[PDB]
Amino acid sequence: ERAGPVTWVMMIACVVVFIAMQILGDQEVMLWLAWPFDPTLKFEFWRYFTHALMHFSLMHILFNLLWWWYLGGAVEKRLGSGKLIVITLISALLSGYVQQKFSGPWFGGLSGVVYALMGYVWLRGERDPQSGIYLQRGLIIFALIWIVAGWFDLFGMSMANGAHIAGLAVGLAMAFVDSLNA
Ligand SMILES: CCCCCCCCCO[C@@H]1O[C@H](CO)[C@@H](O)[C@H](O)[C@H]1O
Ligand SMILES: CCCCCCCCCO[C@@H]1O[C@H](CO)[C@@H](O)[C@H](O)[C@H]1O
Ligand SMILES: CCCCCCCCCO[C@@H]1O[C@H](CO)[C@@H](O)[C@H](O)[C@H]1O
Ligand SMILES: CCCCCCCCCO[C@@H]1O[C@H](CO)[C@@H](O)[C@H](O)[C@H]1O
Ligand SMILES: CCCCCCCCCO[C@@H]1O[C@H](CO)[C@@H](O)[C@H](O)[C@H]1O
Ligand SMILES: CCCCCCCCCO[C@@H]1O[C@H](CO)[C@@H](O)[C@H](O)[C@H]1O
Ligand SMILES: CCCCCCCCCO[C@@H]1O[C@H](CO)[C@@H](O)[C@H](O)[C@H]1O
Secondary structure (H helix, E strand, O other), X not given: OOOOHHHHHHHHHHHHHHHHHHHHOHHXXXXXXXXXXXXXXXXXXXXXXXXXXXXXXXXXXXXXXXXXXXXXXXXXXXXXXXXXXXXXXHHHHHXXXXXXXXXXXXXXXXXXXXXXXXXXXXXXXXXXXXXXXOOOHHXXXXXXXXXXXXXXXOOOOOOOHHHHHHHHHHHHHHHHHHOOOO
């Protein structure tokens, strides 16, 4: 059992971007991938999403990717690539927006998308067990610890609590909708 294409390309893209940052420096990469930081850049649409591709520390990308690999993988295998694509696109946009609004355009990471994924996987398993998707009991605990780490700023994750809540809201919403069909 190997992780699907969406799960795989995201991880590799994040690693490729991370390397570009070690070489060129965080600054340079952000100049090109950050959420529009100036009116002159408002129509460079990739920026509304590419901010999720940057990470600022080893622990940052390590945990983001472990979570993305486990949850993203599960969703893609059990619900398809399309399902993961939408959750990722929407959460990336919403969280980025909330982040930008309250703290400025200088941020990055897949943590907003991770919160959405934790929300979706957990909620869907609780409401629609047999759907096959669910967040392993023991992993709920480490998920909560990862959450607490960011919430009380014990672990630097780039994004603020408000942006992470927006990410979570997206995953909970989609999970609510999905366990609403049948
Ligand atoms: C939340 C994760 C979202 C990841 C989305 C990454 C999308 C990258 C899209 O880039 C686009 O690729 C084109 C290729 O030619 C360029 O021409 C264009 O200028 C550029 O904008
Ligand atoms: C702005 C949100 C849109 C998300 C942007 C997704 C960009 C996908 C770029 O990936 C490439 O897609 C090709 C599709 O054929 C594959 O052949 C190729 O292997 C893969 O590397
Ligand atoms: C403690 C916080 C971090 C938890 C990280 C759990 C990682 C579990 C990774 O599992 C892998 O997932 C892929 C996609 O589902 C499968 O293709 C693969 O066979 C499986 O081995
Ligand atoms: C939130 C979205 C994040 C980016 C998602 C990118 C998915 C890119 C999928 O690539 C696809 O991989 C297949 C297997 O290799 C190729 O056959 C195909 O040509 C290519 O299109
Ligand atoms: C720094 C924290 C690192 C935590 C490492 C946790 C290792 C145990 C995780 O087990 C994983 O559980 C998933 C759910 O059952 C399986 O799908 C997967 O195959 C299995 O590998
Ligand atoms: C993303 C974090 C989501 C909230 C975590 C909830 C912790 C409180 C326990 O809840 C649920 O209680 C059931 C009965 O004990 C468990 O069987 C189930 O596994 C667990 O989920
Ligand atoms: C459905 C989408 C979910 C969006 C969630 C938005 C929550 C943003 C939380 O706001 C925060 O509240 C604190 C107290 O009011 C302020 O101190 C802080 O500056 C502000 O950032």
